[PDB]
Amino acid sequence: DTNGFDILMGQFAHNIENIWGFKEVVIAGPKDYVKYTDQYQTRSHINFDDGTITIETIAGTEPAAHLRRAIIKTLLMGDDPSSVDLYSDVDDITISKEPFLYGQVVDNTGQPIRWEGRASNFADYLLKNRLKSRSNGLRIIYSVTINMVPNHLDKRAHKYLGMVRQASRKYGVDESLILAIMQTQSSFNPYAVSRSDALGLMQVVQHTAGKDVFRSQGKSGTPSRSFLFDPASNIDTGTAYLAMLNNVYLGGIDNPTSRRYAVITAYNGGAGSVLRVFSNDKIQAANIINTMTPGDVYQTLTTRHPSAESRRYLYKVNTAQKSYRRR
Amino acid sequence: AXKXX
Ligand SMILES: *C(=O)[C@@H](C)O[C@@H]1[C@@H](NC(C)=O)[C@@H]2OC[C@@H](O2)[C@H]1O[C@@H]1O[C@H](CO)[C@@H](O)[C@H](O)[C@H]1NC(C)=O
């Protein structure tokens, strides 16, 4: 039930506010894993864009031990988006022989971490030698920061290449487009959740895109949350929507490169909002796009789309797709 | 970039 989720989300944000202060509320996002434990006194933050791991505690007693468990637990947590609640403070059982972060972070030695002993020794180094302090205005927050390896993003994208490969054959969608979208949407974060309900690697909204893809595939209803936190399903669903936007919704755009710009913007903002930039009449809008150059279409969408997000999106996917195109 | 409801 969505209403139940909206309530708990409200409760979750409030519980953080009471302990940390309104100006210290950090919540999990599409590109940011954030997990609260210790009755909200301890939080772990993976920032996937910047490649940093920040572990913080505001516990008044034995701060270092709190950080230690959160450090170790984060370093060794298993890749399980389906199981963990990033909007609860409950301490999920997550330890794994192949941690999610394995190879994406190295310890003090330059070694990858897949077991408690190395994680534990690395936690001592960080506490002894990288411990920082700052204030709420009322309380001390203690933290350590870990920088991920320089190519942490390539390593993450490596997990999903096979899934992208298949999805690309299956629907006739370029591998480079698919990658550019998941990299821009989630930075290859399997735990990705947005404020607008986008779920997973390709950030799929269940009721709009997810529903529409289910129609083409001859289904009724909606993709479930658990279906979309499965990476291959998520990547298959997101790639289908790109094929659908191209073939059906934006099918009246003739120039394939113009249509690509329209499809990239639409993925994010909806096909109607993209067409409405040109006319309130969907056919007349496509006809107008058909009298323009692709560079002009690009220029119109990046400067005159209503949404600053969708506008920035077009630029960021287009730049990214270049890098994935060769191979 | 990061809730929810
Ligand atoms: C944060 O990095 C991004 C991914 O999230 C965006 C973002 N919007 C901003 C920064 O202006 C904000 O955070 C969650 C959502 O709003 C998200 O955008 C949503 O992205 C998906 C694409 O799968 C769209 O289908 C959603 O409709 C879109 N939200 C909108 C435009 O209502």
From Swiss-Prot, chain A:
Protein keywords: Cell outer membrane, Cell wall biogenesis/degradation, Lipoprotein, Lyase, Membrane, Palmitate, Signal
CDD domains: LT_MltC_MltE (cd16893)
Signal as UniProt keyword: yes
Inducing stimuli: By SoxS.
Record has Nucleus as a keyword: no
GO cellular component, one term: cell outer membrane
Transmembrane portions of the chain: none
Topological relation to the membrane, as annotated: Lipid-anchor
E.C. designation(s): 4.2.2.n1
InterPro entries: Lysozyme-like_dom_sf, Murein_transglycosylaseC, Murein_transglycosylaseC_N, Transglyc_AS, Transglycosylase_SLT_dom_1
Pfam families, per database record: Mltc_N, SLT
GO molecular function: hydrolase activity, acting on glycosyl bonds; lytic endotransglycosylase activity; peptidoglycan lytic transglycosylase activity
Taxonomic superkingdom: Bacteria
Compartments where located: Cell outer membrane
Catalytic activity reported: Exolytic cleavage of the (1->4)-beta-glycosidic linkage between N-acetylmuramic acid (MurNAc) and N-acetylglucosamine (GlcNAc) residues in peptidoglycan, from either the reducing or the non-reducing ends of the peptidoglycan chains, with concomitant formation of a 1,6-anhydrobond in the MurNAc residue
GO annotation, biological process: cell division; cell wall macromolecule catabolic process; cell wall organization; cellular response to antibiotic; cellular response to oxidative stress; peptidoglycan catabolic process
Protein role: Murein-degrading enzyme. May play a role in recycling of muropeptides during cell elongation and/or cell division.
Family that this chain belongs to: Belongs to the transglycosylase Slt family.
UniProt name for this protein: Membrane-bound lytic murein transglycosylase C
Organism whose genome encodes this protein: Escherichia coli (strain K12)
Gene name of the encoded protein: mltC
